[PDB]
Design a protein around this ligand. Structure first.
Ligand SMILES: *[C@@H]1O[C@H](CO)[C@@H](O)[C@H](O)[C@H]1NC(C)=O
Lengths: 40, 48
């Protein structure tokens, strides 16, 4: 689940294509949340 | 709110400050000038 952003390399969270009111600010317009199995 | 679809405001010219859909950013001419004036120092966010 390696993902590349402009704030750094993120390991442990899968990348999606939707856009909601973001939960945890990562940076550079990228946020993260805990959703559904269960994952980040 | 989306930018106005038609431009008949009555003679007033807003193309100077409205965004131009010609560059990968939505910055107008004034915004581009203002960005070009001040220079940053962090040099991006990635330095391996
Ligand atoms: C990774 O290096 C490449 C150049 O080979 C560059 O396109 C990219 O900007 C670098 N990664 C980030 C997040 O900037």
């Amino acid at each position: 689940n390696v993902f590349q952003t402009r704030a750094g390399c993120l390991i442990g969270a899968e990348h999606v294509n939707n856009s909601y009111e973001c939960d945890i600010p990562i940076g550079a317009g990228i946020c993260a949340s805990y959703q559904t199995s269960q994952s980040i | 709110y989306k930018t106005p679809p038609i431009k008949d405001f009555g003679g007033f010219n807003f193309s100077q400050i409205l965004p131009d859909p010609s560059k990968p950013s939505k910055r107008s001419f004034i915004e581009d000038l203002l960005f070009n004036k001040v220079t940053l120092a962090d040099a991006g966010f990635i330095k391996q």
